[PDB]
């Protein structure tokens, strides 16, 4: 009935992620990711609604949860065992999430656990009763709704977000001829209908006809769309 603790937990922190799908699972980790190690970290079981609140948002954690985990986790920074202010692993028996608030009251840093330690968490919380902590109870072009990244790998999510970054920049340029070009690249059979249309009406059709799903057509379109923008091209080169 004491506080559960994990030791030597490998984490892959993702900072400032409002959406859980950006806190990548272990099978999505990359060799280029900087993986870190938690010497000791407390483990909490909460009901599903609280877990979802921590996992898919950046809002204030329950005060009782913070004081429960305050300075109970330790990392080895520069050959010295160091206290962390608020860092903990939380689960509802299904999802599992490591959190480091780096001193905030919100889950600034989030990580998934490696599979073997997930299974360890499930076995440790088999007989445990969830803690309530007295808890009681959006999307845009630079922060995609989950329905629009459904079924995509980490790589495809990143290329798709880059594509709609470029489309968002295309909006601010307000060039009618440019948006007519790119829409015709996506849908060349609307040549007659779009020609009375304003820049804004055409950009809307382009967004509406691309936002759903992913495909080789998407990938090829994004590769052309970003040409000439060194910032976008740098992002593309890191992913491909």
């Amino acid at each position: 009935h004491m506080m559960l603790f994990l030791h030597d937990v490998w984490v892959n922190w993702f900072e400032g992620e409002e959406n859980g799908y950006n806190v990548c699972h272990f099978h999505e980790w990359r060799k280029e990711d900087t993986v870190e190690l938690l010497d000791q970290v407390p483990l909490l079981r909460v009901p599903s609604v609280l877990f979802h609140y921590i996992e898919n948002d950046l809002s204030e954690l329950p005060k009782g949860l913070l004081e429960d985990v305050h300075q109970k986790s330790y990392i080895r920074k520069n050959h010295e065992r160091t206290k962390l202010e608020y860092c903990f692993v939380v689960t509802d028996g299904i999802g599992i999430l490591a959190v480091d608030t780096i001193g905030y009251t919100i889950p600034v840093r989030k990580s998934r656990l490696i599979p073997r330690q997930e299974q360890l968490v499930y076995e440790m919380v088999k007989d445990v009763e969830p803690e309530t902590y007295e808890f009681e109870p959006e999307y845009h072009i630079l922060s995609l709704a989950p329905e629009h990244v459904r079924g995509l790998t980490r790589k495809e999510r990143q290329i798709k977000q880059l594509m709609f970054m470029a489309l968002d920049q295309l909006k601010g340029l307000k060039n009618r001829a440019e948006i007519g070009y790119w829409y015709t690249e996506w849908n060349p059979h609307m040549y007659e209908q779009i020609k009375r249309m304003s820049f804004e009406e055409i950009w809307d059709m382009l967004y509406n006809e691309t936002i759903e799903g992913w495909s080789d057509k998407h990938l090829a379109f994004c590769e052309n769309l970003i040409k000439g923008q060194p910032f976008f091209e740098k992002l593309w080169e890191m992913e491909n």
Partner: protein, 147 residues
């Protein structure tokens, strides 16, 4: 455990796509969590890797596999766009890595997800594969021969 055993960034993009397609298969069926059956459904939906050809070599097309899976599961009512892997579905992923290690592979491809599905044992995917008469060792034989 031993950190010389712990190696990250090894899943091939096609293996990650199988696991990504599994969330789509689940929500298509209206389910609230990704189980072993949805990883199997995602595996045969990909259908371009070593696992697909191994299943074809054992006379199992994606059609036959889909209907056997559908024969053992229902359709759900879940509408939450945020969905999680079941604990046993994560077991499949863990066993996939364990299988790659023991075969001496420095990557985790779709062939290891297939073997992880069988090794998990208790789930729908293991049932379906056993129901269609593919044993762990026959599946191993077929994967190793294809490589």
């Amino acid at each position: 455990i031993d950190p010389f055993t712990m190696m990250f960034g090894r899943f091939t993009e096609r293996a990650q796509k199988v696991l990504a397609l599994a969330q789509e298969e689940a929500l298509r069926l209206g389910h609230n969590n990704i189980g072993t059956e949805h990883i199997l459904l995602g595996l045969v939906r990909e259908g371009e890797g070593i696992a697909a050809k191994a299943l074809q070599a054992l006379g199992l097309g994606s059609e036959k596999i889909q209907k056997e899976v559908e024969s053992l599961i229902g359709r759900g009512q879940e509408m939450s766009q945020t969905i999680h892997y079941t604990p046993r579905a994560k077991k499949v992923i863990e066993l996939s890595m364990d299988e790659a290690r023991k075969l001496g592979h420095s990557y985790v491809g779709t062939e290891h997800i297939l073997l992880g599905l069988i090794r998990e044992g208790e789930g729908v995917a293991a049932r379906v594969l056993n129901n269609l008469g593919v044993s762990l060792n026959k599946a191993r034989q077929q994967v190793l021969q294809l490589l």
